[PDB]
Homo-oligomer: A and B are copies of this chain.
Amino acid sequence: AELFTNNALNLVIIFGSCAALILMSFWFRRGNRKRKGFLFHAVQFLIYTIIISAVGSIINYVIENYKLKFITPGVIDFICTSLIAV
Chain A residues in the interface with B (C-beta under 8 A): 5-6, 8-9, 69-70
Contact = CB atoms under 8 A, between A and B. Distances in A.
A63 B9 CA distance: 16
Contacts of A6: 69-70
A9 B72 CA distance: 11
A27 B67 CA distance: 42
6 contacts: A5-B69, A5-B70, A6-B69, A6-B70, A8-B70, A9-B70
Contacts of A8: 70
Contacts of A9: 70
Nearest to A8: B70
A17 to B, nearest CB: 16
A32 to B, nearest CB: 28
A8 B5 CA distance: 32
